[PDB]
Amino acid sequence: AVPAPNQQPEVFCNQIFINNEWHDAVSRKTFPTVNPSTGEVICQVAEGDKEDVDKAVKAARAAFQLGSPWRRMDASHRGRLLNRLADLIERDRTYLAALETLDNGKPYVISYLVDLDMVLKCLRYYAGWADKYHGKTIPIDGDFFSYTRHEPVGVCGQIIPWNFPLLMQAWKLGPALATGNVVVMKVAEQTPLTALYVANLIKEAGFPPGVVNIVPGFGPTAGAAIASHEDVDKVAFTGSTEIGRVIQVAAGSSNLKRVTLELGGKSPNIIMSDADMDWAVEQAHFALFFNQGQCSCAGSRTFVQEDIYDEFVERSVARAKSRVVGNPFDSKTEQGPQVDETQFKKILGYINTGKQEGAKLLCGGGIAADRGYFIQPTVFGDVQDGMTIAKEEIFGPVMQILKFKTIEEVVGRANNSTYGLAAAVFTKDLDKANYLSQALQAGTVWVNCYDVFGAQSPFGGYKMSGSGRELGEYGLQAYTEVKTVTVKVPQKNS
Amino acid sequence: AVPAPNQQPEVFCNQIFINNEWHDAVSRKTFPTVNPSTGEVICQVAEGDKEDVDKAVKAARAAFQLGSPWRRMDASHRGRLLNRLADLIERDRTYLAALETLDNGKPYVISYLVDLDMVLKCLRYYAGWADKYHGKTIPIDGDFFSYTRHEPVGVCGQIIPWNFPLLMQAWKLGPALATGNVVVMKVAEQTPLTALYVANLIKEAGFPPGVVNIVPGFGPTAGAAIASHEDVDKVAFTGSTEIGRVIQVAAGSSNLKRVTLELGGKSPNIIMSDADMDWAVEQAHFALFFNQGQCSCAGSRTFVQEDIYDEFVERSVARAKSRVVGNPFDSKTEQGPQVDETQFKKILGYINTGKQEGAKLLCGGGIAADRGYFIQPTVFGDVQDGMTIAKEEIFGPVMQILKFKTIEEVVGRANNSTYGLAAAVFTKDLDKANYLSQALQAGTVWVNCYDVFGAQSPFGGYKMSGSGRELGEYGLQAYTEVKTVTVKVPQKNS
Amino acid sequence: AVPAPNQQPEVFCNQIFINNEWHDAVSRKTFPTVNPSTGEVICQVAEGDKEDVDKAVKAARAAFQLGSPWRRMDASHRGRLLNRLADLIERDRTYLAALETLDNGKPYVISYLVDLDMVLKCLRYYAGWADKYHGKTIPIDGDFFSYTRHEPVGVCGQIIPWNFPLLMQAWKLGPALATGNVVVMKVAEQTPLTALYVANLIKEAGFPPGVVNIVPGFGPTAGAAIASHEDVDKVAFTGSTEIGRVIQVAAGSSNLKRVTLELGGKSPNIIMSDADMDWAVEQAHFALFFNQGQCSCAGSRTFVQEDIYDEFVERSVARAKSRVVGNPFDSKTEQGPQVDETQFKKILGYINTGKQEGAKLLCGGGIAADRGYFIQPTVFGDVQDGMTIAKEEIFGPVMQILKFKTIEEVVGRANNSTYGLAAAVFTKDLDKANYLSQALQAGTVWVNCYDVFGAQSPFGGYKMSGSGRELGEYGLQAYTEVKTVTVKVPQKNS
Amino acid sequence: AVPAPNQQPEVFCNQIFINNEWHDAVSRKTFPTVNPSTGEVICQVAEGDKEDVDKAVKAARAAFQLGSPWRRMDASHRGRLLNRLADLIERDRTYLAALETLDNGKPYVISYLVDLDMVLKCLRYYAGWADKYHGKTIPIDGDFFSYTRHEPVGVCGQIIPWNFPLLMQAWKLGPALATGNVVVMKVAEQTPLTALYVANLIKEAGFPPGVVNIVPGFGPTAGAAIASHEDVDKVAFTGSTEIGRVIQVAAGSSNLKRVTLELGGKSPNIIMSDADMDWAVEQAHFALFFNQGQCSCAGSRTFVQEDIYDEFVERSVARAKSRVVGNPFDSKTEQGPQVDETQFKKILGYINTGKQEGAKLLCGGGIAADRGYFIQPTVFGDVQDGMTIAKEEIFGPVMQILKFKTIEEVVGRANNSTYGLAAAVFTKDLDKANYLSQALQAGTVWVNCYDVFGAQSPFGGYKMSGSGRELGEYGLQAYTEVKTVTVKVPQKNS
Ligand SMILES: NC(=O)C1=CN([C@@H]2O[C@H](COP(=O)(O)OP(=O)(O)OC[C@H]3O[C@@H](n4cnc5c(N)ncnc54)[C@H](O)[C@@H]3O)[C@@H](O)[C@H]2O)C=CC1
Ligand SMILES: [Mg+2]
Ligand SMILES: [Mg+2]
Ligand SMILES: [Mg+2]
Ligand SMILES: [Mg+2]
Ligand code: NA
Ligand code: NA
Ligand code: NA
Ligand code: NA
C-alpha cells in the first residue's frame, strides 16, 4: 500500500548547508529548479560557487581534525548515527517521496516503494559496516610487529547526478560516513531539493557540524571547484563521460586527489532462444524504460536470437504501447516526464537520428504531451551495431532491438563497446548462463533478471563506464586510506 | 605419460619418526603390513604405543617452545620449506607412486597421475598461505588499540586412515605446518610405508627436529594415546563414525583439546531426466567405483529420474561389467584390491545383505580373484531408502541405484540421512541446479561432475559426516588460535 | 543519569518459551529463584526437563525447515529484527536493569550503565553482520566454477551461566540469529527471570515462532538433555570446567554435534615496576572485584614487581577496605551479594583454605552481613604459585597478590596454569608491553587496562579455559556451516 | 658471504621485448646507458617510442583474449610460473647483482644481499597469492544468488624509476602476474639493462608470449605513449610528482584508465628524548643515506628533541664522516655514485641552496671523486621547516636535522607537508609510540626502526606522495576488476 501524496509539498530547505547551518551564496545569487511535469518553477535555490565551496571544505577539514568529536567518536556510534538518519528519513518518507517526484518527475509510487526504500536499505546496510572494516596484523619477516590501520581518506568531494537524487546521496554518504570521512557534496542543479532536506535530517540525527556539507549549484562552477580544490582528498563522481574526463584531469592538475567514477553505459541485454518469453519481454521492457529510461545501467541494446526475434518484438511493441505516460502523482502512471528541457531535446534528437540512420520505428517516436517534458515510449527494430542509437547513451524512453544468431557472435557484439557498466542474459541453460556471465565485459551481469540492486553487492563499470565500485564491502575501499605500522620487537615468534 | 613402475619397491623407512630420527618402539615390537594384491607380508614396522606417543609429544612441544627455530622462523620461510618438501616428493614421485600401490592396492597409474599430483598441489597451495593468514586490527570502542594475533594452535595430533595414504598426510601437514604448528601423526596400520618415507623427505627439506613426528601403530593403542594426551592441543581425525565418537569423548575426558572430524558418508548423486546421459553414466560410475569405492564422499546413492531410469541402469551395468579388475601395476587395470581382509569380508557381507533385503543384483556380487582381496564391480537396482545398503557406508565396489519422480521428492530422500559429506546434481537446467545445490544438506555439492577436489576449495561434512573444513582458506581455521590484544592509548582516533 | 529503580519489579514471565508461547513444564513442576540480597524467594519458575527440551528442539527444527519464514527471510531483515529487539530492550531498560539486580544481586547502577548497555551494543553490532558474512568464489583448478555458501549450522543449543544473565543471552543470540540459526537456550537456574522476559520482547520484535526457545531448568536435567540431543546441530556453553567436559563427552556420545566452550580461568594481572601506580592499583582492584568477583576473566593472580610490591599492596588494601558492600539498589553500593548460598559457602571455604596454606590475610576474610550472601572484600598477600587460592578459580571477592623479580620469571609463572582465558600487562615501556603480550598464553591480553570488552573484539580461551571465540567477526564462525559448490563449466577463464 | 663479482658483466639483452622475442626500435634508433661509477657508456639500447609501444600493447591484448593460454591457465599454475621465475633469478643472482651495480651504481654487496633477496621474496610472496584472492558470494535481498568474480584488470602499463631497477620490476610484475594480467613495462632510461635480462628469464620460465612486454626508452616518448594509449586498461607509476600529474592527466584525457601512483616524499624521522641513542643514530643514518639517499621514503627530515639534540648531531656527524664512498664493487664501499649527471648536479644544487638559506653545514657538502658522480655524505644542522632542503625531495646523500621541544609540536611540523609516504618514531614509551603512529599522516610509520620492507605489508603514500598501495594483499586491489553476477533463483534460502 502507498500512502496518498501531497502533489504540492512545501519546500523548507533551499540554501547551502555548512556546519549544520543554512547559508546563502556569498554572491547572494539563486537559481530556479523546475517541475518537469509542468515546466513551472518550484522555487529558487542558493547558487553556490568557488567561494561557497571553500567555506564548505574548511568546515569539513575542521571537523576532520585529530581530536574532534567526529574523529574521537566510536566507530559503533557512527553506525548508530547512520541508523538514526535512516529512521528520520523513514519518518518523513511520504514527504520525501513526493518532493522527489515534484523535482525529478518520476512516479510517486516509484519514489515511495523503490527510491526511498532503497535509500533506507543503503544507509542501514553501511551503518552495520561502521565498526567492521578491520585492518590487518601481518606476519612480516624479521623481528617486527606489522599491522595496518584503516583510516578515513579525509575530506571527500561527492558530485552526484539527477536521475536518482535521494538514492545517489545515500550511495555516497553511506560508505563515506561509515568509514569516518567528511563530505562536501554537490547535488545536481536539476534536482537539489530532496538532498537539502536530508541535510536537515542529518543535523537532526546528531551528526557533528562539518561532517556533511551540501553545496547546491552548477557544474562548471561549484562542481569544478571541488574537483580542483587543493584540500579535498577524494572525489566521487557519477554522471556524463565528458565531465568524468574533466574531473580526472582536474584532480591530476590540482593535488592528485583520489578519484572514482561511474559514467553511464550502453548495457547489452541478451535474450537467448530458450529464454522464458513472457518474463524476458517484461524484464527487457523494465530494463530499458525504468525511471524514464534515465538509468546508467539501462538495457539500451536488446539482443534477441533470430528464432524468437519476431515474437519478442511483437510483444515488446505491445508492452511499450500500453505503458501509461502522465502525471507522476497519479497512481496509474508508469512513466513521468524527462528531468529537464535539455534532456527532452537531446532524446528527441536521438529518435530523429534513429529514423535517419535506417532503424525501424515500431511505436511512439514523439512528444507525449503538450505541457511538461513527456516522451512517448519508443521502440526501434532491426538496429545495427554501427547505428548511433546503438552506440551512444540515449538516457530516454528509446528501446533498441537487435537480432543475432550464435552465442559466440553476441559475445563479440555485446563487448564491442567503450562502455561496460552492466549486461544481462536470459536463458534456461546452465552452461550458456555461465559462459556468457564470464565472457561479458561488464561491472554487473544479471541472469534472468535486470536492475537488481542490493546494498550488499558492488556496482561499478568496466572500460569507460567508470572505475571503482559502490555498494557492498567494496564500496568502502575508496573511502579508506591504508597506513602500515611496523614496530621493532625484542624477538618475533609465530 | 607414466614412468614404468618398480613392481617391487624397496622399503627404506619402517620405524617411528621423532626429532628427525628413526626409533624402534620402546617395546621393540613390530607389526606386519600386507600387500592387498597378493596377501603377502611386505615387511615389519615399529608398533608404536602410549610410551612412544609420549616421546613424540614431548619432542613436538619442545620444538614449539617460544624462541625455538620453528617459532622464530619467518612465516615466508615456512612456505619455502613446504615448497622444498613438494620438490623432494616430486623428485621421488615414481618411487612413492609404486610404494603407495604396493601397500594400498590402488592402480599405479592412479597413484602417479592422481594421488601424487594432488599431494604436490596441496603442499604447494598451503605453502603460499604461510605468510598470508592475516590477523585483524579492530576499531573497538573507547580509547584503545585492539588487534588479533593469529597464532598456531600448538601440538597437533593427526590420526589418518588408509584409503589415501599420501594424500591424507598432505591434507593434514599442509595447513598445520603453514600455520606454524607441530605435529604428532598416527598413520593407518594398513598403509604406514609411504607416510614414513615422506618423513625422511621432511628431514631432508630442512624442517627442524620435532616439527613433524610420525608414530605408526594401531588405533586403540597409539591413536587413543594421542586423543587422550594431556599435552596435545588439537586433534584432527579422518575415518569411521565409531572412532570419531571415541576421539571426541577422549578429548572431553582429557584436556578439552580442539577437535575436527571427517567420518565418511552416503552421498546422494541425483541424475535429473534432462541430464546428459553418456556424461552422467560415466561420472556416476566414477563417483562410486573410484579408489575401489573406498572414498568417504562416494556417490553410494545414485538417484535416477524414472523417465531415464531403465536406460541409465542398462548403461551403468555395461560400464560396470567392462571395468577391468586385476594387478594394480598393470596399466590396463581400472580397479585393484580392497585395502585388507577386514574390509574384504565387510563388503562381501554388505553384498549378501543387499541380496537378502530384496535389492536387485544386476552384475558382479562376488570375489574377483583367487589371491588378494579383489571384488567384482557390483550394481544393485531398485534400491529402497530403508534398505541397509542404502543407509550404511559400504566402502567397496557396490553401487546402489534408486528411482524417483519429482525434484521435491528427491530432496527429502537425499537429505534423509545422518550423513552429509557430499552430493551431486546432473542437470542442464539452471533453476534445477541452483534449487538442488541450495537444498542439499552436504558439505560439497558437485554439479554435472563428481569427485572434483581442489586445494582451493574446502571439504568437510554436515551432520554426522564430521565437523570443520579441510583445504582452502578454511582449512587454516582449525590450526589457528586467536589472541586479542587490547592496548590503552592516549586518544583514539579514526 | 541513572533512573530510580523499582526495588522489587513484578515478574511477568516465569515459564518455558516455545513457538513464541508460554508453557508449563510437562511435569507441571516448578523451582524457586532466590533474591541473593535477602535470601527470600522471588517466585516459582517452570522446571523444564528432557520432555520439555524435546518440544523445544522440534519447534526449532520446524522453524529451520527449508522454505520457512526464518529461512526465506532476507539476511538484511534478520538484521532489522535484531535492531528492533535492541530498541525494545532499551525501551524496557530501567525495568530489566532492576530485575537483573533482583535475581542476580549485582548493583543496579552497574546493571543499568554496564550490563544493559553492553547487551544493546552486542545485539546492534551483530545486527550489522547479518548480511555481511560473505562466502567465497574460488579460482579452483580445471574448467570449474567453485564457490562457498555460508549457511546456518542449524539448531543451536545454548547453555549459559548466571554471572551476567542478560549479557550472556545477548552474546549467544546475537551471532546465532544474525547467521540465521535457531535456538534452544537453557538459562541458569539461579537467574532465569530476565532472560525469560527478553523472550517476550523477542516475540514482540517479530521473530518467527520457534526461532528462539528458552527452557529454564536444572543442568543435569534440561542442560544435559540438550547436550545429548540427537537433533541439536551445535552447542555453546559457558560455565564450569567440570561441566564443560560433560558437554563435550555428551556431544561425542550422541550425534557428534559441534561444540564451543568458555570455562572460567585464573587470569594473571602483571604489574611492572614502571607502571602508573595509581592507575594500576585501581585497575587491578576492578580486575578482581568486578561483579562480586564473578568474572571468568577476573585478574585472580596479581603479579607485582618487588620494587613496588609494598606500596602497591598498601594502596590495594586501602581500596579494598573502602569498597562499599550492601543493598544493590542503593546508589552507594559498589558490591552486592554472591549469586547464591552454594557460591557463598564455596568462597568462604577458599578463604579458609588461603589462611591454612600460609597466605597472608590483609583485610576482610569473613561474612559482610547477617542476611543475604555478602562477603567482605578479601586480599591475600605473599601468595605462592603452589597455593590453592593461586591455582583454583575462586569466583568471589578474594584478591591474590604475588611478588616477582624479572620479566622472564613472570612470563613462566603466568603461563604455568591450565587456564588461559585472559591476562594483563601494566607498563609504560613499549618493548615490555609487546614482549609480554606475545608471550602470554591467553585469549585476551589487556595492556594498561582490564575487562575491556567490545562487541568488535573476540573473546575466548586458551588451554582448558575453552575453545572457540565469541564476539567480533570470529563469533560468527561457530554458527556457520560451510558448503562448497563446484560446477562444471564449458571453459574456465581468469 | 658474498660470491666475488664479475666487475665487467657481459650484456646479453639490449632490445625491446615483445611476444617473448627481441626487437629493435621501429626507428632503429638506440640510446646509451652509462656506468655512473666511471661516467663511461656501457652499451647501446633500443630506443622505444609510440610505434613500439603500440606493437607491445597489441601483443599484450592478444595474450589477454578470452580462451588464450594465459587466460585459461589455472590460477595455481600462474603461481608455479612466478616461483619458477624466482628460481631462475636466484640461479643468476650473482650475475644480476653485478649488472645491477654496473648500471645503477649501488654497492654490489647491497645489490646481492638486499635488492636481489627482496626481488626473490616479492616474486615468491605473490606466487602464493595467485589462487587465493577470492571473490564473494553475497546474501543479497530477494530471490537471487549474487556473487563477485575477481577478474584481471587487463593490459597494465607499468612505468618504473631507476633507484631500484630489479626490485621495482618485481614489485610491479608480482601482483599483476599473480592476478592474471598482461604487462607493457617501460623501464627507466638510466637503468634498462637488468630488467631486460629478467625478460629473458620470463621467457625461459614458460610465460606465454605477450604476457610481459618490456619497452626501454625515454619518458615523454614511450612512457607518455602508454599513459595515453586507448587500449591500456590500467597504469602504475613510480617516480617524480611532476610526471605523476602528467600520467593522471593523460589517463583522464585518453580512455579513463585506472591509475595508481608513488611520487617520492619528505618522510619525517622523529627521535624522542627517551630513544636508545646508539640505535636511533645508526638507524637515522641508514634512513637517510640508504641507496645513495635515492629512496622515496628516505628520512629526509630528522626531528630530534632538544635535550638530546647536541649528542645526536655529534654522533650523526661522526657516522657520516666515516661513511665509505667509492667503487661499488669494492666490499668496503658503503656508498656508490648517484645514478646520473642530472641527479648529481641537482643534489649539489640543493646543497648550495642549503648553505644559502642559513642551514648549518656540519660535514661533506661537495664532490667526493674526480670521475663518476660521487657526492660526500652531507649533514645540515639547525634546519628550519621553511627551508628548501626541508621541503623538497633532494634524493641524495644530504641529511637534514631539525630540533623540537614537545610531542604535540613535532606532530604538526611532521604533518605540515604535501608529502606523506613514510614516517618514523624512536621512543621506548608505549603511549608515545601509539600517539605518534596514529597522528602521523603517512603511508608507513616505522617504530624504532626504518626502511623495513616486507612483501607482506602494504606500501604507498598519503596526500601527494601518491595513491593506492603496493605489496601485501592490498597490492592486488589495483590489479583486479570486480564483476558482480546476480542470478534469479526459484527460492532464496539462508
Ligand atoms: N572417513 C573415511 O574416509 C574413512 C572411513 N573409513 C570407514 O571406517 C570403516 C572401518 O575402517 P577402519 O580403518 O577400521 O576405520 P578406523 O576409524 O577405525 O581407523 C582409522 C584410523 O583411526 C585409528 N584408530 C582406530 N581405533 C582408534 C582409537 N580407539 N583411538 C584413536 N584412533 C583409532 C586407526 O588406527 C586409523 O589410523 C571403513 O569400512 C569405512 O566405513 C575408513 C577409512 C576412511
Ligand atoms: Mg553536462
Ligand atoms: Mg576400526
Ligand atoms: Mg555445577
Ligand atoms: Mg623527470
Ligand atoms: Na528540478
Ligand atoms: Na597394507
Ligand atoms: Na536468583
Ligand atoms: Na645507467
| CA of A339 relative to ligand 6 center, distance in Å | 7
Name the nearest CA neighbour of D95 among D112, D82, D110.
D112
Q: Which helix (H) or strand (E) holds C237?
A: strand C234-238
> Which residue's CA is the nearest one to ligand 1's atom 11?
B240
Cβ separation B446–C142 shorter than 8 A: no
Helix (H, G, I), strand (E, B) or coil at B469: coil
Q: How far apart are the first and last CA of chain C?
A: 59
Angle between helices A93-104 and A193-205 (to 10 degrees): 150
Residue C459 CB burial class (10 angstroms; 0-12, 13-18, ≥19): buried
Atom of ligand 1 nearest to the CA of B188: 37
Q: Which residues pair with A22 in a beta bridge?
A: A17
Cα angle D35, D40, D41 (rounded to 5 degrees) comes to 80
Separation of alpha carbons B451 and B424, rounded Å: 9
Specify the DSSP element, H or E, that contains B378: strand B378-381
CA B343 to ligand 1: nearest atom: 39
State the Cα–Cα distance between residues C131 and C124, nearest whole angstrom.
Answer: 13
What is the C-alpha to C-alpha distance for residues C148 and C152, in angstroms, rounded to an integer?
13
Q: Decide if D444 and A486 are in contact by the 8 Å CB cutoff.
A: yes
The C-alpha atoms of residue D480 and residue C139 are separated, in whole angstroms, by 14
Give the Cα separation of A415 and A408 in Å (integer): 11
| Side chain identity, residue B57 | V
Contact: A492, B72; criterion CB under 8 Å: yes
Is residue D424 helix, strand or coil?
Answer: strand
C2-264+455-494 and C265-454 in the same fold: no
Cell digits for D218?
625515454
Cα D228 off chain centre by: 22
What are the helix (H) ranges across D374-486? 407-415, 430-439
Ligand approaching nearest to the C-alpha of D240: 5
Strands A466-467 and A258-262: antiparallel
As a 3-state breakdown, chain B gives helix, strand, coil percent values, each rounded to 5, of 40, 20, 35
Pairing between β-strand B268-271 and β-strand D444-447 as defined by DSSP bridges: unpaired
How far apart CA D196 and CA B286 sit, in angstroms, is 49
DSSP state of B403: E
Residue keyed to cell 592422481:
B114
**B78 near B119, Cβ under 8 Å?**
no
CA C245, C247, C250, C256 torsion-angle sign: negative
Find chain B residues with C-beta within 8 A of D435's C-beta.
489-491
Q: What is the DSSP letter of D119?
A: H
Measured in Å, residue C252 CA sits from the centre of ligand 3 at: 17
Task: Give the Cα separation of D111 and D113 in Å (integer).
Answer: 6
Q: Which residues of D touch C66 (CB under 8 A)?
A: 493
Determine phi and psi for A312, rounding to 5 degrees. Answer: -60, -45
- Given a contact cutoff of 8 angstroms between Cβ atoms, the answer to whether A250 and A228 are in contact is yes
Sign, Cα dihedral of B250, B256, B259, B264: positive
Q: How many CB pairs under 8 A join A and D?
A: 195
Cell numbers representing residue A16 in the block: 547551502
Give the 3-state secondary structure of residue D258: strand
What's the rounded Cα separation, in Å, for the pair C77 and C74?
5
- β-bridge partners, B186: B159
What does the alpha-carbon distance between residue B289 and residue D153 come to, in Å, rounded to a whole number?
A: 43
* Nearest by Cα to A270 from A67, A473, A432: A432
Q: Which three cell numbers stand for residue C341?
A: 548460598
Q: Please report, for chain B, the start and end positions of each structural domain, with discontinuous segments joined by +.
A: 2-264+455-494, 265-454
List Cα–Cα distances, C142 to A277, D77, D302, in angstroms: 34, 11, 54
Query: What is the H or E stretch that residue C100 is in?
Result: helix C93-104
Record: contact A146-D449, CB cut-off 8 A: no
Technique used: X-ray
Neighbours of B266 (CB within 10 A): 24
Ligand (nearest to CA of D40): 9
The span from the CA of B232 to the CA of B176, in Å, is 14
Q: Is D407 left (phi over 0), alpha (psi -120 to 50) or beta?
A: alpha
- DSSP 8-class letter at C116: I
- Closest partner residue to B83 (CB to CB) among D83, D145, D489 is D83
Exposure pattern of A202-219 as b/e (b: 16+ CB <10 Å)? bbebebbbbbbbbbbbeb
Q: Is the dihedral of CA D121, D126, D132, D137 positive or negative?
A: positive
Instruction: Say which DSSP state B366 is in.
Output: S
Q: Which ligand is nearest to the CA of B220?
A: 1
The CA-based angle C268-C273-C275, given to 5 degrees, is 80
The whole-angstrom distance between C181's CA and the closest CA on chain A is 19
Q: 3-state DSSP helix/strand/coil percent for chain C, to nearest 5?
A: 40, 20, 40
Q: How far is the CA of B197 from the centre of ligand 7 (A)?
A: 15
CB atoms near residue D3 (< 10 Å): 10
Residue C41: strand pairing partners: C34
Q: Using beta carbons and an 8 Å cutoff, which residues of C are at the interface with A?
A: 75-76, 79-80, 83, 121, 124-125, 127-132, 134, 145, 430-431, 434-435, 438-439, 455-456, 473, 487, 489-491, 493
Architecture of the D2-264+455-494 domain: 3-Layer(aba) Sandwich (3.40)
Contact criterion met (CB < 8 Å) for B132 and D489: no
Check the CA dihedral D197-D202-D204-D210 and report its sign.
negative
Nearest C-alpha neighbor of C378 from the set C392, C364, C360? C364
Which residues neighbour D286 within 8 Å (Cβ) at sequence distance 6 or greater? D450, D451
User: Residue A408: how many CB atoms within 10 A of its CB?
Assistant: 10
Please give the distance, rounded to the nearest whole angstrom, from the Cα atom of residue D170 to the centre of ligand 9.
19
| Cβ neighbours of C132 in D, within 8 Å | 139
In ligand 1, the atom with minimum distance to the C-alpha of B244 is: 17
Cell of A250: 582536474
Residue in A131, A439, A487 closest to C456 by CB: A131
**What span, in angstroms and rounded, lies between the C-alpha atoms of D172 and B400?**
55
Parallel, antiparallel, or unpaired for β C30-35 and C40-46?
Answer: antiparallel
DSSP state of B191: S
Count CB-CB contacts under 10 A for residue D416.
11
- Dihedral pair phi/psi, residue D434, rounded to 5°: -70, -35
Closest by CA to C478, choosing from C175, C75, C241, is C175
Residues in Cβ contact with C122 at an 8 Å cutoff, skipping those fewer than 6 apart: C167, C170, C171, C174, C455, C471
Helix (H) or strand (E) holding B466: strand B466-467
DSSP string, C49-60: -HHHHHHHHHHH
Cα gap C227→D358, rounded to integer Å: 79
List the alpha helices (DSSP H) in D191-230.
193-205, 224-228
What phi and psi, each to the nearest 5 degrees, are found at residue A164?
Answer: -140, 75
Cell 552447542: give the residue: C235
Interface size between B and C, measured as CB pairs under 8 A: 192
For residue A388, how many other CB atoms are within 10 A of its CB?
14
Paired with A138 in beta bridges are A146
Q: DSSP string of B22-46?
A: EE--TT--EEEEEETTTTEEEEEEE
- How far is residue D204's CA from residue D192's CA, in Å, rounded to a whole number? 19
Residues 6+ apart with CB under 8 A from A252: D244, D245, D246, D247, D248, D249, D251, D252
Long-range contacts of B203-207 (CB under 8 A, 24+ apart): B203/B20, B204/B88, B205/B81, B205/B84, B205/B85, B205/B88, B206/B81, B206/B84, B207/B20, B207/B70, B207/B81, B207/B85, B207/B177
Say if CB D178 and CB D127 are below 8 A apart: yes
The chain A residue lying nearest C488, using CA atoms, is A431
Nearest CA to ligand 1 atom 34: B219
HEC profile of chain A: CCCCCCCCCCCCCCCEEECCEEECCCCCCEEEEEECCCCEEEEEEECECHHHHHHHHHHHHHHHCCCCHHHHCCHHHHHHHHHHHHHHHHHCHHHHHHHHHHHHCCCHHHHHHHHHHHHHHHHHHHHHHCCCCCEEEECCCCCEEEEEEEEECCEEEEECCCCCHHHHHHHHHHHHHHCCCEEEEECCCCCCHHHHHHHHHHHHHCCCCCCEEECCECHHHHHHHHHHCCCCCEEEEECCHHHHHHHHHHHHHCCCCEEEEECCCCCEEEECCCCCHHHHHHHHHHHHHHHHHCCCCCCCEEEEEHHHHHHHHHHHHHHHHCCCECCCCCCCCCECCCCCHHHHHHHHHHHHHHHHCCCEEEECCCECCCCCCCECCEEEECCCCCCHHHHCCCCCCEEEEEEECCHHHHHHHHHCCCCCCEEEEECCEHHHHHHHHHHCCCCEEEECCCCCCCCCCCECCCHHHEECCECCCHHHHHHEEEEEEEEECCCCCC
| Alpha-carbon span A396 to B156, nearest angstrom | 65
Give D159 Cα–ligand 5 centroid separation in angstroms: 12
d(CA A20, CA A69): 14
The distance in angstroms from the start CA to the end CA of chain D is 60
Q: Please say whether the dihedral angle defined by the alpha carbons of residues C14, C15, C18 and C20, taken in this order, is positive or negative.
A: negative
State the CATH class of domain A265-454.
alpha beta
Q: Terminus-to-terminus CA distance in chain B, angstroms?
A: 59
The neighbouring-strand residues paired with C261 are C237, C467
Query: Nine-digit cell at A217?
Result: 549549484
Residue A185, Cβ neighbours under 10 Å: how many? 25
Ligand 1 pocket (Cβ < 6 Å) reads B 159-161, 163, 186, 188-189, 218-220, 223-224, 227, 238-240, 243, 246-247, 262-264, 296, 343, 346, 393, 395
* Contact call for residues B303 and B410 (beta carbons, < 8 A): yes
Helix (H) or strand (E) holding B91: helix B75-91
Q: What is the DSSP letter of B483?
A: E
Strands (E) located in B89-216: 135-138, 144-152, 155-159, 182-186, 212-214
Between vectors from CA D475 to CA A453 and to CA D167, what angle results, nearest 5°? 160
Q: Pick from A273, A277, A280: which is nearest to A305 by CA?
A: A273
Run of H or E residues at B16: strand B16-18
Chain D residues closer than 8 Å to B145 by CB: 434, 438
Angle between the A93-104 and A165-178 helix axes, to the nearest 10 degrees?
120
- Eight-state DSSP code of residue C4: P
How far is Cα of residue C164 from the mean position of the Cα atoms in its chain?
6
Closest residue on chain C to A433 (Cα) = C489
Task: Inspect the interface and report whether the beta carbons of C473 and A132 lie closer than 8 Å.
Answer: yes
Separation of alpha carbons A419 and A411, rounded Å = 14
User: Nearest CA to CA, how far is D494 from chain B (Å)?
Assistant: 9
Give me the residue from B435, B473, B492 closest to D132, CB to CB: B473
Task: Identify the residue whose cell numbers are 621421488.
Answer: B92
Atom of ligand 1 nearest to the CA of B263: 1
Between CA C220 and CA C230, with CA C225 as vertex, the angle to 5 degrees is 150
Q: Are A4 and A330 in contact (CB under 8 A)?
A: no
Q: Which residue of A has its CA nearest to B481?
A: A494
- The cell numbers describing A305, all together, are 536470437
DSSP code for B9: P
Q: What is residue C340's DSSP assignment?
A: S
